[PDB]
Amino acid sequence: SKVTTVVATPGQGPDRPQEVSYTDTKVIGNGSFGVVYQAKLCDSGELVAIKKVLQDKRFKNRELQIMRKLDHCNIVRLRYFFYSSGEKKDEVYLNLVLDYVPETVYRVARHYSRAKQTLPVIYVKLYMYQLFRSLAYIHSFGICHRDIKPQNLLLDPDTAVLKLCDFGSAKQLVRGEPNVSYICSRYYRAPELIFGATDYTSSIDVWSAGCVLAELLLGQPIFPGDSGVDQLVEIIKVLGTPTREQIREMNPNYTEFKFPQIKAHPWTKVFRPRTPPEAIALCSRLLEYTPTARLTPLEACAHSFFDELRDPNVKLPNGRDTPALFNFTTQELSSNPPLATILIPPHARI
Numbered sequence: 001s002k003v004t005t006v007v008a009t010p011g012q013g014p015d016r017p018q019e020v021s022y023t024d025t026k027v028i029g030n031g032s033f034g035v036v037y038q039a040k041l042c043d044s045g046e047l048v049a050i051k052k053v054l055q056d057k058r059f060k061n062r063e064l065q066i067m068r069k070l071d072h073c074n075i076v077r078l079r080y081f082f083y084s085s086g087e088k089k090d091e092v093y094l095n096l097v098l099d100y101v102p103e104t105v106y107r108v109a110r111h112y113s114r115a116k117q118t119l120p121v122i123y124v125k126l127y128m129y130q131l132f133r134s135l136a137y138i139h140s141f142g143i144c145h146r147d148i149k150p151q152n153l154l155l156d157p158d159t160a161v162l163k164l165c166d167f168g169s170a171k172q173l174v175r176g177e178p179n180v181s182y183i184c185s186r187y188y189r190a191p192e193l194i195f196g197a198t199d200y201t202s203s204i205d206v207w208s209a210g211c212v213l214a215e216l217l218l219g220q221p222i223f224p225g226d227s228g229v230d231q232l233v234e235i236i237k238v239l240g241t242p243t244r245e246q247i248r249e250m251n252p253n254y255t256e257f258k259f260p261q262i263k264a265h266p267w268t269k270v271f272r273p274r275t276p277p278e279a280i281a282l283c284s285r286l287l288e289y290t291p292t293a294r295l296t297p298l299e300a301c302a303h304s305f306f307d308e309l310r311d312p313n314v315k316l317p318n319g320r321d322t323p324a325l326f327n328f329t330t331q332e333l334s335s336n337p338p339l340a341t342i343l344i345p346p347h348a349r350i
């Protein structure tokens with residue numbers, strides 16, 4: 001195909017643009033944001049994703065500012081960004097050139113569902129552990145992703161590396177500064193949001209992660225609501241009716257749903273009989289009504305459900321070694337540095 005040459009600015013480091021050539025553009029996604037393409041870097045031959053968004057010339061793109069400060073093995077990397085012009089007065093596009101990753105958790109999970117099989121729990125551990133690490137990192141800056149779902153969990157199936165993508169809903173949450181409640185993808189939406197809360201925290205992402213974990217264990221979404229309000233009905237069918245205290249802790253803006261009383265369905269009867277007890281226990285501490293009762297991402301990483309990953313003999317099913325799971329920086333551990341003793345086993349220590 002015809003080569004495109006641009007002058008692009010590196011994601012990290014000082015603003016020093018470089019000539020970049022790419023080719024073989026292919027549309028691979030769209031949304032309210034604009035369009036995402038696959039492309040191939042001419043010089044190195046590496047595939048990349050290019051996220052193209054209409055951007056107002058006189059304002060700053062929030063996703064860009066967030067992407068320029070993130071540097072983590074479980075977060076898709078911003079290689080470069082550049083501006084391109086459309087065929088209209090002041091029609092400017094921001095182009096984000098990101099790492100290409102060949103699969104998603106959604107796609108992998110679906111393969112197992114269609115074959116009427118469960119994803120082996122080793123992959124559930126690996127994928128969930130890496131999601132929680134990515135969340136521990138972004139939360140340490142005060143950034144809440146606000147769109148955790150299987151479709152935004154990229155994976156390389158050969159190395160089992162997971163990378164979080166799509167920071168178009170991400171935001172630095174500030175105590176006392178309101179936020180919109182109609183956020184996140186419905187099935188993964190925290191109950192406080194359904195109650196119209198505008199004063200919420202990063203614990204909304206932990207709820208969404210819990211929904212991902214349950215989905216990988218069940219073979220299908222645990223809370224498949226057909227509307228914003230029916231989402232709460234689905235949650236209630238498992239968790240039971242929230243108490244008045246639990247409702248208060250969710251900081252709701254309305255609660256006039258007039259829900260009939262429903263008993264909680266026991267967590268052990270939700271999943272198949274052979275589900276590991278530690279998976280169930282972890283899940284019960286993520287999917288909690290009271291936001292502050294939920295595990296932090298770092299505490300989730302230290303859960304006994306991930307003990308297999310801390311074993312020195314662990315290997316991937318393809319024979320290869322596990323990716324780097326314990327190379328925690330001081331930033332990643334800042335919420336609770338004493339957890340390093342559990343998070344970093346003897347053989348991984350330096």
Ligand SMILES: COCCN1CCC(CNC(=O)c2n[nH]c3ccc(-c4cncc(OC(C)C)c4)cc23)CC1
Binds near residue numbers: 028098
């Ligand atoms: C020949 O056919 C192959 C099809 N194949 C199917 C899986 C696919 C997985 N990879 C990615 O999505 C992928 N990689 N790097 C990214 C970097 C950014 C994004 C991304 C960021 N913000 C919003 C997005 O919105 C979509 C959710 C609509 C996507 C995705 C990505 C590879 C293409």
